[PDB]
């Protein structure tokens, strides 16, 4: 008999699905593979399933707001960055900490990974080499966030801890700029908006807003 098999899309592992700025793309973890699917009005289809290994499940995955790269962390402490044009894994490197939060810049140049030990590393996307590694706070990372303009010279990297803490760093100077202890629990989500104002969603009950400067001017808005 003829048979058409319909397969699941977002099944198994608890990692967020990601899309680019357009709805044309989506990336999803099934238990070991990352199905990429195009959504177009009407003609929604699949691109290609990547089949790294059936043993380890995908821990996290991120697709840049332009559909050019896919960065995914598996159960072994390594990140695999994979080209989307050719459909080929370009690089893969161990990180020695099980990463769970992946945040990419709006521009496709930087992407940062963060795990449980508290140390985070931010890698360049086009050339897979890590610029700098932050020791960070001693708590497990719960979120990160980027602030970068398209043509500027200042880049901010904010980390929301399992502790009620957000550490914002300069990137062009790599310094612990501001350590704001305000929540009581994990910082599930983060955000940075233009003037500076910073928002932080602490998972207990709180949405903090900080007026902020490059200099020591940072209080509770």
């Amino acid at each position: 008999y003829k048979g058409i098999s319909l397969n699941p899309i977002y099944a198994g592992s608890s990692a967020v699905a990601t899309v680019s700025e357009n709805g044309k793309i989506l990336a999803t973890p099934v238990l070991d593979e990352i199905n990429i699917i195009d959504l177009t009005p009407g003609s929604r289809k699949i691109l290609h399933k990547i089949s790294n290994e059936d043993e380890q499940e995908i821990t996290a995955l991120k697709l840049t707001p332009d559909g050019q790269y896919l960065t995914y962390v598996s159960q072994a402490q390594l990140l695999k960055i994979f080209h989307l044009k050719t459909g080929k894994v370009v690089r893969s490197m161990k990180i020695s900490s099980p990463s769970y939060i992946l945040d990419a810049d709006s521009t496709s140049t930087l992407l940062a990974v963060g795990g449980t030990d508290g140390s985070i590393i931010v890698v360049d996307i086009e050339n897979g080499y890590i610029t700098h590694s932050f020791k960070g706070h001693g708590g497990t990372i719960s979120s990160l966030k980027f602030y970068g303009q398209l043509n500027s010279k200042i880049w901010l990297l904010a980390s929301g801890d399992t502790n009620g803490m957000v550490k914002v760093w300069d990137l062009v100077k790599r310094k612990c700029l501001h350590t704001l202890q305000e929540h009581t629990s994990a910082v599930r989500g983060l955000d940075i908006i233009e003037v500076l104002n910073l928002l932080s969603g602490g998972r207990d009950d709180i949405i903090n807003l900080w007026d902020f400067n490059m200099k020591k001017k940072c209080k509770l808005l």
């Binding site: 521009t107 496709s108 140049t109 930087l110 360049d124 080499y129 890590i130 610029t131 700098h132 590694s133 970068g148 398209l150 043509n151 500027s152 010279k153 880049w155 990137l171 062009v172 100077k173 790599r174």
Partner: protein, 199 residues
């Protein structure tokens, strides 16, 4: 590291690149005398092939294995050494505990005569007599048949080897405890050894 930013095309930025662990384990005195006697053939594999700092507290009658954060390589080396000293403590021979260090799938199993069948004194003596056999004949028969190492304490008995091997040895020993004569259990040993040699 110095900190400067390079503005690429499309205005993109460009940057450039930038625990010890301890276990302790006791030793009973009747196995502390052979430990002192053959200690000099115990620590060389621990210090040379395992990279495991070894102390011995004779004031607490214990052996301590601490792994160094930088000198060691393998994580499981500490647990392998602890199982090594544990087998020698339970009373196996030195080369056999070295074999436990040498392989990765050797296991040690232990059970008792009252865990098989409650025996009261003189019958228990005769049961250990039937297990041991005249000059260890039946015991070494089980050894050579199933490729294991058997140690008979006062009541507790210990079997070292692979999983299925110590399973078959346990079957033969338990039949010996329940009272199968050594002739019948020896026939069963040579049958299981025939099929194990064939496979």
């Amino acid at each position: 590291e110095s900190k400067t930013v390079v503005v690429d095309d499309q205005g993109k930025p460009r940057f450039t690149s930038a625990k010890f662990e301890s276990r302790k384990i006791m030793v009973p005195p009747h196995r502390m005398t052979p430990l002192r006697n053959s200690w000099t053939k115990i620590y060389p594999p621990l210090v040379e092939h395992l990279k495991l700092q070894v102390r011995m507290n004779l004031k607490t009658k214990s052996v301590e294995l601490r792994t160094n954060p930088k000198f060691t390589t393998d994580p499981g080396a500490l647990q392998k050494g602890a199982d090594f000293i544990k087998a020698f403590t339970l009373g196996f021979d030195l080369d056999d505990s070295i074999a436990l260090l040498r392989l990765d799938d050797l296991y040690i199993e232990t059970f008792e005569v009252k865990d098989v069948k409650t025996l009261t004194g003189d019958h228990l003596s005769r049961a250990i007599g039937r297990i041991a056999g005249k000059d260890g004949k039946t015991k070494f028969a089980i050894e050579n048949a199933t490729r294991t190492r058997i140690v008979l304490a006062d009541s507790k008995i210990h079997i070292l080897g692979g999983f299925t091997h110590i399973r078959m040895a346990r079957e033969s020993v338990v039949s010996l405890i329940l009272g199968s004569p050594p002739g019948k259990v020896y026939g069963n040993l040579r049958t299981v050894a025939s099929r194990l040699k064939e496979r």
